[PDB]
Ligand binder design. Structure first.
Ligand SMILES: CCCCCCCCCCCCCCCCCC(=O)O[C@@H](COC(=O)CCCCCCCCCCCCCCC)COP(=O)(O)OCCN
Ligand SMILES: Nc1ncnc2c1ncn2[C@@H]1O[C@H](COP(=O)(O)OP(=O)(O)O)[C@@H](O)[C@H]1O
Lengths: 241, 295
């Protein structure tokens, strides 16, 4: 699968400076003149915020400060004036191949220091290894049978995002090939919920799980995210911790 | 593995397709006062679309079944309207013009596509494209006109060219913004086209007239079936060629196929053509090839 590499792990910037964040792909991500790349912003403890679809286009409502560029395998995100508002982690993810992958993430810091949808995850917090687990995402204010893609995404400790699977409003579903043998995604239109089932969970499954709505345009864009649910897999039942 | 099979397959399939189209549209049915003419272009296009859809479905369900189609249905319907209109108009134009004229006219897609891009998309092209288009215009003018006016056939050809340009624009847009696959393109476009054509022929009453005409001359049914089969096989080979060699090779192969189709139509069916008109067609094809080379 395609691997996305972000060169500056951390940047120290002064307010008002211009910062460029690079993102390099292991394979060409162009398709009939369109670069299938997206950029996301994630403040500490919050779900990622969708910024850019394609290499250059800016999502409506995003400030004019942000601006993407690049083509082929090399891309960059530029913020000409930087304010305290936009100090966060930035992720680049391609959408050329079915397993969608995110970059390791770049962190910025100050030197010297009816359309609206409510996603809500739920599920057990502490689980034992090899047990069967099921996560529920409840959608309010919108119908999951109306439009858009409904995905499940998890973020391991260290901020390594990983796309898992989605179920479209048609009912068609797609899975991450690495996990197709371990998980299954289903939906219940009556209650307006879609679930994710994990069987034989291992200690490596500890992560924060998000359920996000998405629409396809120059790639898949996870514009709307839930607050996420923390899943911990431990051999011993954690107590006083 | 060496893969010249793409060229051979596409060439043979579409050459036979062109011969069958010449036989059908411009055929002679009956003699004397009983002589008739083929006016059922809508039914021909409907059969062609049905066969194309069936073959595309077979290919999808056997080959590359893991893909997911992200294109919206309404986009498919909108593109299919123009695609069906272009094909129907081109087929109906043969009721007035000679087949070589129809082939030459329908081979001039770059002119309308560039015009739409410049006027609607406000795109820009290198000097080579304009010069290449200049050669095509010069060749068409030398062919379609002589020192010694426009009828219904030329108007139909112009309308078909405009609809082909619109279809190309729509296909490029949705391919860029939705990563549409060629097989899904074919399947959905042909499905929508056959739905619309079925509605149109049923509510126009042309289906019964076509059935009576076929009863009078049953030989046409085999020709129509072979025409559809050849179109579908050529479509499949075009898909395989673009998969294995991209669009440039497909364009070159189709251009040479069209030139050979014109030559065969002139030689076999005794279509009259002046030596000056030959210069026009060769210039048109040279310009088309150069445009393909220089993007
Ligand atoms: C968008 C919809 C998609 C296109 C649908 C297909 C378009 C119509 C094609 C089929 C109509 C066939 C026309 C026909 O039968 O001929 C008539 C002529 O058709 C016309 O009305 C004019 C020529 C075709 C329409 C285009 C006119 C120019 C307008 C478009 C401008 C292009 C830019 C009358 O000819 P006649 O009396 O000598 O004998 C006919 C049968 N024996
Ligand atoms: N990549 C492609 N190149 C050419 N034709 C294609 C391609 N994909 C699908 N097609 C379909 O094949 C049919 C015949 O193509 P053709 O007109 O010969 O191509 P060209 O105009 O490039 O010579 C068209 O109706 C088109 O819809």
């Amino acid at each position: 699968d395609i691997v996305m590499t972000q060169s500056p792990a951390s940047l120290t910037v002064s307010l008002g400076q211009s910062v460029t964040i690079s993102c390099r792909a292991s394979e060409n991500v162009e398709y009939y003149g369109t670069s299938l790349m997206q950029w996301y912003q994630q403040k500490p403890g919050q779900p990622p915020k969708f910024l850019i679809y394609g290499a250059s286009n800016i999502e409506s409502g995003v400030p004019a400060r942000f601006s993407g560029s690049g083509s082929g395998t090399d891309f960059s995100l530029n913020i000409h004036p930087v304010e305290e508002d936009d100090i966060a982690m930035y992720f680049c993810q391609q959408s050329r191949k079915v397993p969608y992958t995110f970059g390791s993430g770049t962190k910025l810091e100050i030197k010297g220091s009816s359309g609206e949808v409510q996603l809500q995850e739920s599920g057990p917090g502490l689980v034992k290894p090899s047990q069967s687990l099921s996560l529920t995402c409840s959608v309010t204010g919108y119908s999951i049978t109306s439009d858009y893609y409904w995905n499940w995404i998890r973020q391991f400790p260290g901020n390594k995002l990983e796309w898992m699977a989605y179920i479209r409003y048609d009912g068609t579903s797609d899975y991450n090939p690495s996990l197709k043998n371990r998980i299954s995604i289903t939906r219940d239109t009556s209650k307006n919920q879609f679930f994710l089932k994990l069987n034989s969970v291992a200690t490596e499954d500890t992560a924060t799980y998000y359920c996000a709505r998405a629409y396809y345009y120059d790639g898949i864009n996870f514009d709307y995210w839930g607050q996420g649910t923390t899943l911990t897999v431990s051999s011993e039942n954690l107590y006083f911790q | 593995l060496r893969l010249p099979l793409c060229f051979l397959g596409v060439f043979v399939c579409y050459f036979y397709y062109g011969i069958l189209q010449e036989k059908i549209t411009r055929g002679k049915y009956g003699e004397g006062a009983k002589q008739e003419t083929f006016t059922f272009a809508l039914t021909l296009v409907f059969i062609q679309c049905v066969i194309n859809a069936v073959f595309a479905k077979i290919l999808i369900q056997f080959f590359d079944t893991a893909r997911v189609d992200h294109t919206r249905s309404w986009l498919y319907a909108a593109c299919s309207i123009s695609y069906l209109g272009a094909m129907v108009s081109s087929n109906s134009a043969l009721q007035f013009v000679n087949y070589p004229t129809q082939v030459l006219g329908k081979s001039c897609k770059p002119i309308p596509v560039m015009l739409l891009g410049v006027t609607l998309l406000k795109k820009k092209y290198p000097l080579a494209k304009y010069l290449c288009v200049l050669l095509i215009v010069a060749g068409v003018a030398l062919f379609m006109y002589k020192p010694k006016t426009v009828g219904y056939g030329e108007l139909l050809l112009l309308l078909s060219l405009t609809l082909d340009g619109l279809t190309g624009v729509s296909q490029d847009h949705m391919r860029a913004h939705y990563q549409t696959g060629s097989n899904h393109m074919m399947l959905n476009i042909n499905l929508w086209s056959t739905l619309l054509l079925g509605m149109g022929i049923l509510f126009t009453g042309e289906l019964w007239e076509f059935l009576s005409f076929a009863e009078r001359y049953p030989a046409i049914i085999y020709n129509i079936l072979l025409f559809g089969l050849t179109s579908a096989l050529g479509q499949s080979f075009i898909f395989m060629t673009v998969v294995y060699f991209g669009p440039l090779t497909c364009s070159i192969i189709t251009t040479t196929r069209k030139f050979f189709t014109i030559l065969a139509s002139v030689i076999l069916f005794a279509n009259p053509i002046s030596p000056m008109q030959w210069v026009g067609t060769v210039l048109v094809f040279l310009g088309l090839g150069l445009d393909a080379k220089f993007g």
